[PDB]
Structures are given as structure tokens and as C-alpha cells.
Design a protein around this ligand. Structure first.
Ligand SMILES: COc1ccc(O)cc1NC(=O)NC(=O)c1ccc(F)cc1Cl
Ligand SMILES: COc1ccc(O)cc1NC(=O)NC(=O)c1ccc(F)cc1Cl
Ligand SMILES: *Cc1c(COP(=O)(O)O)cnc(C)c1O
Ligand SMILES: *Cc1c(COP(=O)(O)O)cnc(C)c1O
Ligand SMILES: OC[C@H]1O[C@H](O)[C@H](O)[C@@H](O)[C@@H]1O
Ligand SMILES: OC[C@H]1O[C@H](O)[C@H](O)[C@@H](O)[C@@H]1O
Lengths: 791, 791
């Protein structure tokens, strides 16, 4: 009740924060509420983990280097059914709950979609009552805080743990040793890994509350600790550096030794903990291991788990190779997230030989047995051997981590129908021919808790008033909103909810940027990590085309827009940082032009993260999902926008294909080249200058960027962009330009008719049910992990 | 009460530790009790700090680089009067309180006497109800954990904060910036220190409960925080390294740049915090500053506080030099703890110019106004100018921090009557001649809470049963125990308390060391930091003399002894490490000799720290305080042993003189040369060869060490010890040998007469009253700080 929540808050402010109402800060009030909310899940947290020990169901271990959790206060209150009572408790005490919630730092331990998928999955697995654990690294610094200085991206350290974290709880008794370097000794006692450097792994447990049930699961994150005198003590920082910072690479492989250290650190600590828990349970002694343990590999990042489990089985537990291999394959499952060559992990053998010598011997041994099996099936095909090998012998010998994951797992999955098909029939064609039942599809999803109930209370309330509150546990029930198709009362209520969200977010934009936002404008948003494949550059070419159309004929009819493009660029990604400079330079010319005025405003939304995503998404009218066909594995941003009342402009890529299947192709703004048309242009050879010389609209845009219209001080500034666009554009920006601007004209035409726009929005929300991560998890549960959703 | 404490423990185990009785650890139980005990302090902690804000009494700021606090649980339970109730509550829950207490890490943020004095002072200031604050550094690693491997000292990092500290609380709102490096500009708007490197200072508050009163003061400890991308984030460790580790130097100056960074870090953060609190209180505005603030400099370590207070006053607060200097002198007071030349802080001007350019300018200007006065008073004395200068011109220019401290303070004090005299009349003679009223004496003391009530509940109970409990707050009441000299039953009750403590500690010695302890043996103990001045070597010579006496005549009457020598040696101190190996080598030969047996046992007490001092001191019969006359400033270990029922064997050095004055010289075992006799041997010339050939017992001892009787596998191992003893011994070990062995024979004779021994013990305990830190703090309060005790 309300009275006990106030009493608990006051008890925490006094005893935990050591303050009275006279000198307490807003931060003290946030902590007092956080501790009060955490206290309310303790009973269910203990009981859930006790239940798993007592009944011994098959456990699911989600092993990831990334968990993009965001803020947990409001999420926990909603899932526990305590939001209304806490809101009232805080009000009665004369405080503002929005002010307290804003103090919380995001647990930004992820780069983008991959890390967010892991977070949505934890929420879904707990809601479904599965015996699931999330395993990762407790990075002291998550994804950097982004600032825009003089039009460029600047990085600031994300010191999220500065003032503490009230959600985590250290588990001292489960501290484990992780070994590095050393050498291999082949004695008569067996194979030993000696002379190693030890780094301790201290686990921290964070609660994962299920939506309105009695389940509270665990996310276990590991922190690295160390096991002239002053210098020896200062050098302890080197061991602790393993869990210091998240590598800010999204869909890009950077082969640094510290990243390999992180990957092994989480793998070794996690596997030892899982084996310890297995041995402590009610269950030669490992025959029942895959019937009790399922470990999911989120990308190839924790691929080292395969030879590490083999190392524990063969070297420590003394199990013979063949049995150890059978058990390993049945335990692991791998999820592929990209087909891009630069995003694939290929670790140099020399680096792995130095850091993990025993693991390299095991990888070689796995490759030996794998290749000997292909010789027995195909003796005359010599090229299939080097193509299927885990080792790439060309010049500098590297280990293909994707191939290691395929041979060491019983199931390999993609993240959307179109993607899983390319993974199966194209990229790993040789593997899928040998074992057809290994490769499968698991279309991505998002949690309707954080991505609807939390972020958009207005739309959540609207839907509940019309079709009932049953849609949260079964999102397919959103189809019942079709009963209101001709109803002008509902279409006006839907637009009013969108307007309330737009007005709230416009207040944020005017305080952070010097801009006068037009309240009647179409919120055109592209928020995702900055990449050449995601094509924020194509969006920028359209913003310039619109600017050039207004300057040509000022008194002509133009549908007002607020173009918001946001996202972080990897610090070492030159081209992405150039795209950001281009967007901010275009923004300064468009926003300060008196002829344009309220017709078009451009905003580069700084520091795009989970909490900001929660604010921008419900305020969006148009969603930009313009990646080149065959490059975006799935995308999850697309599903968030669809659930929140926005229309989608995009290519037939990733999950956009499935969104089009569910809502009806005519209900999305699909344009451009499809998978076959991109492949037909690769065989012919991409000549970018043809589109520049054929389309006059594109010529003026590119000339303005090349001459220095957007940069009068530095006319040679965007030359790296021009040289890429003409000779090295693997993502064919100019090839999709015409179809894009024509499609954007159709979006503008529909916005002028509120009734038709909102009828299309209704069809998108009503068909967004398949995109619940609850659906995605039920499929992984039935066809991969072999676990049953309990209530 | 008991039932309420059990409920609170259970509540904490559930909500704070997330555990039930089935999986709860010993660590979990400690934390649950710790939080239960801390909760009982909260109300009085808020009320005490609120009282200081509301009434504004004169505040005392004890500024120190060291706070050797030890464990907090038992101390807090005793000071709040909850120990008996907690012991009962824990027993009823089926647990042992002593087991839970052993989990707590010592807050070993000190080296020895200097840091322990600061800790005793905090306990005393809070007991007397003074508005006092302790200000230091929250070292991530305190004094190293000492391990003995192959007879040598090995250092291990003291990772005291790994599992958390329940006795601290971060104060986010009081985070302050500290500046380093940069350059100085003297503009028309005042002097500006610009282009600096910033390191943030985050304060952590720890409660300091007064004994059985309403006062709970604060100990504020500062932690350093920082304000290729990956490398930039990792390089944040460099700023954090300032508060990483305590410099393990006891009475030794090591001129490392990191130590200077630490000294300024604590000073800047402390002074900025004091000024903020002053300006935020009820009532030019800085005229009342010295009447509201008193800052005590614990050694020269925080000497930079003088030019820093001048910097804030002149550069930031825009006060003129003359007024700024007047206030600075009346604010500061300096406590000298050193006698040795190598212990004095003499920082190179080049190091100070690079790091703190503005402070050097202020130090130069202080020196100029200082030297101009000496030219105006004594014109024809040019040698007095270079002697009194804050700058040493000899070779590479250095700043004499002791001279800076004297001129910038209104009061200077030594720590014992003999020390203060040498500080006044000899070392700083030139300063005392100009200002006699500045130099004072403040004889050291120890808190009877930790050093009697805590460590020796049996003796504390016995004393309370006879004379009441008023002695805890006024230790001079122990004089009433003189009335019980002819009381045979009380003498027997006193002897039993000692035997029960010896039995309890003998259990510790049998568990940690593989040695059989004789219960009827005399516990001969020398525990303090290892140094040549303290003469652990002189003790070692006597141990070998006793060994030889048993080997020459096995049937002779020998009084059994258990000689315990313990203490840490500084890592870079070679001679101290050689002395440790000599003791362990002697131990292995003596303990394993069948002809000796239960007659003599030697133990090198490993990892001597505050918690271990609490165990060994109450179990001691003979206290060794054998430093060379004129080398130990005071000593505090001497006082702890006297209060705990042990007799003292020592020289007339430091506070040993005053212990003899209080108890009667015939009641202590005083030997050797005094201050005047050491000076007479320095004048003639010390020849250690004379005492070697004149004494036959010393000849056998030195031949055994040089020939390798204690090191058969390495005959030339103790070559450095023999070379030092004969040619380079500034502490004249051989000159005190004869008088020491003769005095030790007298100790042995008295031990054979329990009635005479215990009567002498009673005369020592009954006269230990002056040595309470309450008496010391009352004198600092009256004669230096101008504050009044209240309740
Ligand atoms: C200056 O202290 C206060 C003055 C007036 C008040 O109404 C309250 C306070 N202080 C207070 O409420 N708390 C503290 O002072 C405090 C906070 C944190 C901590 F670790 C220790 C304390 Cl004693
Ligand atoms: C394995 O979990 C348990 C099994 C049986 C029990 O009687 C109790 C437990 N667990 C328990 O009491 N607590 C926890 O499991 C726990 C401890 C710390 C933390 F951070 C989270 C949890 Cl859920
Ligand atoms: C959902 C989400 C993403 C993934 O977006 P895509 O558009 O699918 O790449 C990235 N970042 C944040 C902060 C998100 O919430
Ligand atoms: C009291 C004490 C000291 C100081 O001892 P002296 O014998 O005075 O040098 C040093 N270390 C510890 C741990 C102490 O308790
Ligand atoms: O699978 C989760 C996400 O992983 C990666 O971020 C992919 O680029 C994205 O398409 C996918 O949605
Ligand atoms: O003043 C406290 C202590 O400071 C130093 O440690 C001195 O060496 C010691 O003699 C003194 O007792």
C-alpha cells in the first residue's frame, strides 16, 4: 500500500542516506525510492532462485558482452505493479517523481540493437517464467556520453557507477579465478596449462522482474580484480582494465588484445559458475548437463565458450574427447547478427597463441576432426576444405569465430526471415548442406513493457480503454483494434496521444538546441548508430533536396517537417564522424535561413541511448529504416516505432519485410532496390556518376556539398564523403536516391489527410503483435533451448 | 534490547543481503550485524552535525595523511553501550559474535604511531563532545598485508574495500575540484592559476561515536576521481592513482612525486570544504575565521595547507596579504613527531615549481617576510639567515616543510616532555628564541575505550567492580586502585585476568604457528614497526644470549619465556628486512632444539596491525620499549602495555620517562644510557669493537651470527648486519647490551615471585591515568584550539 511505501522511503532516507528533509538532495530522494522498490522484490527474488534449486528445471544462460539495460526504476515499478502506489507515495511527500527518475544513470552496457536485444530478452524470459540468467561484464564505463562541439562528435566517459548502483548486489562467495597467458606442457599426466597470470572475477547480481508474475530472474555481471612496491600496487590497474570499458564498436571488428581478454574473461567466469551450479544441484556425471543447461551465444563475441567448455571437460574433468564434444554441441546455440565482412570476428592465431595457448590447441583439434569428416564425404573437392576450415591460411592466419560457433553448436539462428535465409543458403552454404536441421530463424522482438507501457503511457491507456488490458501478456490481441477502423472518434484520440508526446518532446528540443519547433510539423526521425550501411547519408541528401525545393519556389505548398537524425559513431570510424559533421552543417544552414523558417527544421539528437529512445520514439510520425537491401540483419528500432504510432519509410530489408507482411505492404512506405536488384547491380558493376549526371536533383545536392555551400570556411571538408560516394560506395546511396525522394513525396501527401494517415497508423499498431519479444522467446524456448514457459 | 536487535539483524539479512539462513555466509552475517549497529548511530549522527550548524561552536579539523583506525564493529558497539545486547542477540540466533567480527577488514590507513594517534584522538574528541572532524585520504589500499615466506617479509596488497565498507557513506554534493600543474599569470584582476590538470575529490564520511554520550562526529576521507578512445578511458587511472595506496614509510622521507600529489590533494579538498562550511554558516567576512576554525597539522605531511589557505584568501577571496597571513597563523597549529634527519620532509623546488607553481610563489613570499624580520632583529648574523630560511640552498634547492609549518602556525608541539624540549631548545632553537610562547608540549595518549574496554574486557570489568566505571571518561581515577596494594585476593584476580588473556592468545599462536606454547612462561613482547632506532636487533641479541645459557648449562634454573617480536618493515628498507630474517632464523633454531624445549620459544608475529595489537597487548607480561635515548619521540605502544597489566623494560626515551615519573622509577625496568650519556659517546667517538672484546657473551652471539650458526646454507647472509653493527651504527646497540642483559636478569628474578610482580603491575595500572588521550585532547583544547568540552 501507499502508507507503507512512504514509511519505507522515510526509513531509507534516514538510515541508508543519513538525511532529513531539510538537507536531502534530489539524488538522495532517488536512492531512497530505488532502495524501497528493490526491497519489494527481495521476497520474490529469493523464492524464484530457491524454486530453481528445488525443482531443477532446464536453465537458459544468455551469454553476452552487451546488456543495454537503460534505467531500471520505472521498469521495476511497472513490472511489480507498484507504479501507481509509488507515484502516490512520492506525491504525498511533496516530491516530483519525474525529477527523481531523471537522476538515474542508464546502464548503457551496450552498443545498439545487439545489446538491446539481450535486455528485451531478459524481460521476456522473466515474464514467461523461464529459468533464465543473463551473463555479462560489469563495465565501469558503458557506451560513451556523446556531445556535439563545433558540429563534431566528442566522447566523454560514461561514469555510470560514480555515485553507486542501488540495483546490483555483489556476490563475494562466488568469486572465481580466470587464467591468461602462460604455456602448454605435454606431460605423462596429460595436457596442462601452466605459468599463467590470474585475474579474479567478482560477480554482481541485478534483479530482472517479470511482468506481473512471481518471477524475478538474475543478470550476473562480472568485474575484474587483481589477485618498486608502489608501482606493483598501481599495476593492479592492468588486471582491472579488463572490465573497465565497453568497446564502442557496432557492426565492426576491431582486433585488440584487450577485447580478446574481455571475451575470455566473461566466458571462463560464466562457464565455471554454470558447472559449479550444475554440480551443486540434484542433477559420466555430465551426461545430464545439456538436459539441465542451454547456453546461448549472442554473436561470436563469446565464441571462446566452446573450446573453454571442452578445456574444462577434457583437461579438468578428464572426460574423453568424443563424449565431451557431444555434450558441448548439445549445450551451445549461436545467434548470428550480421553478414557484413568487416563485422565478422577473425582473431589472429598469434594473438590467441600468446593469450590462450591451450584454447588454440583445442580449436586446431576441433578443426582437424571437422576437416577429416569433410574429406570422408567429399574427397575430390579441395576448395571446400579451406572454405569450411576454422582457420583462414591466407597471408596472416586468422581464426574464423563464426565457423567455430557453427561446429560447436546444435542450432544456429539468424534474426529475421530474409537474414536467416542469407546465413543458411549463402554465407554458410557449405555448413547448411551437411546439417540441414541446424540452421533456423528467430525473428527479433522488443518488450512491450519498456517499449509501450513505460515509454508511452498515453497510447497504452488508449489501447486499454478500447480493447482491454489483456494485450500486455499476449500482444497479438492488438489485432482487436481493427474494430475501430471507420471510427473518427478513435482516430482523433490516436492523434491527440501523438500530439501530447510531440509537445512534451518539443519542450526538450527547445531547451537543448536553439530552434523553434513547428507543433504542426511531421516528426521525421532516424535514430540508430551511425553507419554507411544504415544510410543516414541518404537521409541527409533528401533534407538538402527539400531545402533546394523551398528556395526555388518559396510560396509553394510544403508539408512542414522536423527531421531528427541521431546516433553515436564509433570513435575510430572516420566516415561516420564525417556524416555527423555533414548533418550538423546542413542543420545550421536550414535552421538559420529566413526563407525556409517553420517549413523545415533539422536536429541532430545528441547522446542517443535507451532513456532518450523512450522519449523520441512515442513522439515520432515517420520512421526512417533506409538500410541497403541485405545489410540490416533485422533492426529493432523499426518495431519500436511501429508499436508507438509511427509510419515506416524503408527498404525491403531485415524485419521491415516482416512488418510489411503483417500490416500489409501498402501500409508501409517501401521503396528502392530489393535483394535481387542489389545483386544485379554488383554483377554489372556500380557506376555512381551515372545517377549524378542523369538526375539533376542529385547533381545540385552533391555540388553544394563539394563546392562548400554547407562549409564556407572549409570548402574541401567533405571531400572524403564525395570520394566514397563516387568510387567506393558499397552501399549504393545514389542508386536508391530517386525512389527515396518519390516515396518521401507520397509520405508528405498522406500527412495532409489526418484521417488517412491515422487509419494507416491504426493498421500498423494493430499488426505489431508479432514483434513482441515474448513471441521471439517462446520460439527460442520451443525449438532451441527445449524449455517450457511456466506460470 | 535483545529481541529488537535480533529482528533488525534478520531484516538486514533479508533486505540488505538478499539471504535466508540456508545460504547466508559468515560475511553476510557480519554485514547484517554491522548495518544493525550503524542504524543505532544515525539519529545521533544527524543531530550532532545539525547541532554544529545551528549553534556554530569553534570547529577542530584534524588534518592527517594517516588514520590507523583498525576495525569499527566492536568499538561502535562498546561506545553505544550495545555490546552485551548484541552478543546475546547473536548467540540466540545460533552464531558466534567473535567469528563475525573477524570478517571485518582493518582500516589500516596508517603506518604506526602517527596514524594511531589520529585515531585515538578522534575517539577522544567525540567522547569529550568537541566539534571535531578528521580529514584524510580514503586509500584504496592501506598498509600492506605482511606475509613471511622462507623467513623473509613479503608484501601483499591490502584490498580492504573489495567487499565494501558498511561504515562509510559517499557525499556526492560535496565533490570538489583539485588543481595540478599549469602556469601563473599576474593580471590586473589578481593572480590566476590557469591551464591546470583537474582531479576530482569525492568525500566519504565515517561515524566517530563518542563513548556513552550523544555525540557522533565525522571522519571525512577523500577519494580521487577523474573529471585512441580506449586508452583515454584507461588513462583515467592516472588521476585515480592519487588515492590508490598509502606510502608505507614510517619515520622516513621518500621524495616521490605521487606522495606530493597526495599531500596537496588532501589539503586542497579539505581547505575548500572548510571554507564552504564557514561561508554557509550563520555567521570582508573572514575576520571570525580563526575563532570558528582550528586546523591541526599532523606532522609536516599537510604543510601545504599554509600556502593553500593563503592562496584561497588572496587569489579567490581577494583579501590583502597582511590580513590573510594574520588569519592563517591563528588558524594553524603544528605537531612535530620526528627526531631523525632522514624523517624530515625536504621537497625539491623544481618538483614543487612544476606541480604547484602558485604555492612556490607564496612559499617564497612567506620566506621573504620571514627573512626581512631576522635582518631587522639580527643584522650581523648571516648564518642565522640560511639556518632559518624555508629554502635550503645546499646543492639542489629544497623546501624545509618543518620551517614552513612553524612560521605559518601559532602553536608548535612535541609529543613528550623530553621530545618537546629538544624541538624547542635544540632542533628549532632559532625559532623559539624569537617566539617562546609558540612552542609547547602535548604528551601523547591512547584511548581507554579501544585500548582497555575493547581489547581487555576482563581487566576493564575487574577495575569497574572495585572503583566504578567513572575511570573510562577520566582515567586519572585509576589512582584509587592504590588502596588495593595489600589486597591479596585482588592481586590473584588481577593475575587470573592476565592468565585468561594469555590462554586465549596462546590458542591464536598455536593455530597460526606450528609451535607449542608453555602457559606458565613470561610473555616477552616487542611489537612496533621494524627500525634500527627501535632496536629489535638488541632484543634478538638477548634471545641468543638466553639460548646459549640453556645450552651451556641445561640443569640450571631458567625462568621460561615466550619472546614475541612483531612489526612491518618498509619495502625499500633493506636493514629492517635483514633484521626480520635474523629473528626468524633465530626462531627456527631455538624452537626446534630438544635441549631447550619449553624453556624458550620465539615467534615473529606476522602482519602486526591494530586488530592484532588488541589481541597481543592484553596477553603481555613484559613490554620491550628499548629505543636508543633521544630517538623515540614519545611512543604509544608503551602506554597500551602499561594500561593492560604488563611491566616495562626500557630506556629513558620518549614517554617512558613520564611512565617512570607516574609509576615510580623502581616500578619500571629502566636501563642503559640516558640523553646526556649518548651525547658524551658521540663526542668521544663510538667504537663498537671495544664492547665486543670486553663482553664474552656478546662475543659468542656475534660470532654465531657472522659464522652462519643461524644460516648454515648461507654463512655470509647476515654480513650487512655485522658491518652495520661494527662500523655504521648510529643507534649504539653494543653500548646498551650489558645493561640490557643485566636488567633482563632482574625481570626474570621478579617473575619467580608472583606477589612482587603483581604488586608492581598494580602500581603501573594505577598510574597509567595520565596516558589517556582524553587528557591529551583536553590540553590541546585548552592551550591550542581554544575549544571547550561539552555533553
Ligand atoms: C549539517 O547537517 C545537517 C544540518 C541540518 C539538518 O536538518 C540535517 C543535517 N544533516 C543530515 O541530515 N545528515 C548529515 O549531516 C549526514 C549525511 C550523510 C552522512 F554520511 C552523515 C551525516 Cl551526519
Ligand atoms: C540458490 O538460491 C537459494 C536457494 C535456497 C535458499 O534457501 C536461498 C537461496 N537464495 C537466497 O537466499 N538468496 C539468493 O539467492 C540471492 C542472494 C543475493 C542476491 F543478490 C540475489 C539473490 Cl536471488
Ligand atoms: C532499439 C535501439 C537500437 C537499435 O536500433 P536499430 O534502428 O534497430 O539499429 C539502438 N540503440 C538504442 C538506444 C535502441 O533503443
Ligand atoms: C600502538 C601501535 C603502534 C605504535 O607503537 P610504538 O611501540 O609506540 O611504536 C604501531 N602500530 C600499531 C598497530 C599500534 O597499535
Ligand atoms: O539482432 C539484434 C540486432 O543486432 C545488430 O545490431 C544488427 O545490426 C541488427 O540488425 C539486429 O536487429
Ligand atoms: O606522536 C605519535 C608517534 O609519532 C611517530 O610515530 C613517532 O615515531 C612516535 O614516537 C610517536 O609516538
Amino acid at each position: 500500500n501507499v502508507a507503507e511505501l512512504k514509511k519505507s522511503f522515510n526509513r531509507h532516507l534516514h538510515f541508508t542516506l543519513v538525511k532529513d528533509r531539510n538537507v536531502a538532495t534530489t539524488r538522495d530522494y532517488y536512492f531512497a525510492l530505488a532502495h524501497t522498490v528493490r526491497d519489494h522484490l527481495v521476497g520474490r527474488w529469493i523464492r524464484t532462485q530457491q524454486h530453481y534449486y528445488d525443482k531443477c528445471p532446464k536453465r537458459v544462460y544468455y551469454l553476452s558482452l552487451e546488456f543495454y539495460m537503460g534505467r531500471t526504476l520505472q521498469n521495476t515499478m511497472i513490472n511489480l505493479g507498484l507504479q501507481n502506489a509509488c507515484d502516490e507515495a512520492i506525491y504525498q511527500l511533496g516530491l516530483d517523481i519525474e525529477e527523481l527518475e531523471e537522476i538515474e544513470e542508464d546502464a548503457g552496457l551496450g552498443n545498439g540493437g545487439l545489446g538491446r536485444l539481450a535486455a528485451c530478452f531478459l524481460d521476456s524470459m522473466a515474464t514467461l517464467g523461464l529459468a533464465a540468467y543473463g551473463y555479462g561484464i560489469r563495465y565501469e564505463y558503458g557506451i560513451f556520453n556523446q556531445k556535439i562541439r563545433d558540429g563534431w562528435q566528442v566522447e566523454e566517459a560514461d561514469d555510470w557507477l560514480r555515485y553507486g548502483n542501488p540495483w546490483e548486489k555483489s556476490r563475494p562467495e562466488f568469486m572465481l579465478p580466470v587464467h591468461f597467458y602462460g604455456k602448454v606442457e605435454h606431460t605423462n599426466t596429460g595436457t596442462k596449462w601452466i605459468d599463467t597470470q590470474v585475474v579474479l572475477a567478482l560477480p554482481y547480481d541485478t534483479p530482472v522482474p517479470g511482468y506481473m508474475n512471481n518471477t524475478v530472474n538474475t543478470m550476473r555481471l562480472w568485474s575484474a580484480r587483481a589477485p618498486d612496491y608502489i608501482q606493483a600496487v598501481l599495476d593492479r590497474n592492468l588486471a582491472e582494465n579488463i572490465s573497465r570499458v565497453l568497446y564502442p564498436n557496432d557492426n565492426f571488428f576491431e582486433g585488440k588484445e584487450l577485447r580478446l581478454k574481455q571475451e575470455y574473461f566473461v566466458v571462463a567466469a560464466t562457464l565455471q559458475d554454470i558447472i559449479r551450479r550444475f554440480k551443486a544441484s540434484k542433477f559420466t556425471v555430465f551426461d545430464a548437463f545439456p538436459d539441465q543447461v542451454a547456453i546461448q551465444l549472442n554473436d561470436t563475441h563469446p565464441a571462446l565458450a566452446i573450446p573453454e567448455l571442452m578445456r574444462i571437460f577434457v583437461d579438468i574433468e578428464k572426460l574423453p574427447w568424443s563424449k565431451a564434444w557431444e555434450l558441448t554441441q548439445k549445450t551451445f546455440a549461436y545467434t548470428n547478427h550480421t553478414v557484413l565482412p568487416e563485422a565478422l570476428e577473425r582473431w589472429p592465431v598469434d594473438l590467441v597463441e600468446k593469450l590462450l595457448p591451450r584454447h588454440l590447441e583445442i580449436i586446431y583439434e576441433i578443426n582437424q576432426k571437422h576437416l577429416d569428416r569433410i574429406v570422408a564425404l567429399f574427397p575430390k573437392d579441395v576448395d571446400r576444405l579451406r572454405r569450411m576450415s576454422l582457420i583462414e591460411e591466407e597471408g596472416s592466419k586468422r581464426i574464423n569465430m563464426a565457423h567455430l560457433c557453427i561446429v560447436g553448436s546444435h542450432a544456429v539462428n539468424g534474426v529475421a526471415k530474409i537474414h536467416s535465409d542469407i546465413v543458411k543458403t549463402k554465407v554458410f552454404k557449405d555448413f547448411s548442406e551437411l546439417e540441414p536441421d541446424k540452421f533456423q530463424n528467430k525473428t527479433n522482438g522488443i518488450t512491450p513493457r519498456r517499449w509501450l507501457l513505460l515509454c508511452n503511457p498515453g497510447l497504452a491507456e488508449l489501447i486499454a480503454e478500447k480493447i482491454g488490458e489483456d494485450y500486455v501478456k499476449d500482444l497479438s490481441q492488438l489485432t482487436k483494434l481493427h474494430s475501430f477502423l471507420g471510427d473518427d472518434v478513435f482516430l482523433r484520440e490516436l492523434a491527440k496521444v501523438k500530439q501530447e508526446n510531440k509537445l512534451k518532446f518539443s519542450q526538450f528540443l527547445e531547451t537543448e538546441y536553439k530552434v523553434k519547433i513547428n507543433p504542426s510539423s511531421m516528426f521525421d526521425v532516424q535514430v540508430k548508430r551511425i553507419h554507411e550501411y544504415k544510410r543516414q547519408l541518404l537521409n541527409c541528401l533528401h533534407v538538402i533536396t527539400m531545402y533546394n525545393r523551398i528556395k526555388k519556389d518559396p510560396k509553394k505548398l510544403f508539408v512542414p517537417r522536423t527531421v531528427i537524425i541521431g546516433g553515436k559513431a564509433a570513435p575510430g570510424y572516420h566516415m561516420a564522424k564525417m556524416i555527423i559533421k555533414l548533418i550538423t552543417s546542413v542543420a545550421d544552414v536550414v535552421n538559420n535561413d529566413p526563407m525556409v523558417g517553420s517549413k523545415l527544421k533539422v536536429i541532430f539528437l545528441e547522446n542517443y541511448r535507451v532513456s532518450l529512445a523512450e522519449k523520441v520514439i512515442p513522439a515520432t510520425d515517420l520512421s526512417e529504416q533506409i538500410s541497403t537491401a541485405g545489410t540490416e540483419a533485422s533492426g529493432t528500432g523499426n518495431m519500436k516505432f511501429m508499436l508507438n504510432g509511427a509510419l515506416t519509410i524503408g527498404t525491403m530489408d531485415g524485419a521491415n519485410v516482416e512488418m510489411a507482411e503483417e500490416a500489409g505492404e501498402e501500409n508501409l512506405f517501401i521503396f528502392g532496390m530489393r535483394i535481387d536488384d542489389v545483386a544485379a547491380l554488383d554483377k554489372k558493376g556500380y557506376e555512381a556518376k551515372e545517377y549524378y549526371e542523369a538526375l539533376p536533383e542529385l547533381k545540385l545536392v552533391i555540388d553544394q556539398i563539394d563546392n562548400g555551400f554547407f562549409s564556407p570556411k572549409q570548402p574541401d571538408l567533405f571531400k572524403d564523403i564525395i570520394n566514397m560516394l563516387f568510387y567506393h560506395d558499397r552501399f549504393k546511396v545514389f542508386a536508391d536516391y530517386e525512389a527515396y525522394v518519390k516515396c518521401q513525396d507520397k509520405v508528405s501527401q498522406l500527412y495532409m489527410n489526418p484521417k488517412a494517415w491515422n487509419t494507416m497508423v491504426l493498421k500498423n499498431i494493430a499488426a505489431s503483435g508479432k514483434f513482441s519479444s515474448d513471441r521471439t522467446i517462446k520460439e527460442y524456448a520451443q525449438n532451441i533451448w527445449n524449455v517450457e514457459p511456466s506460470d
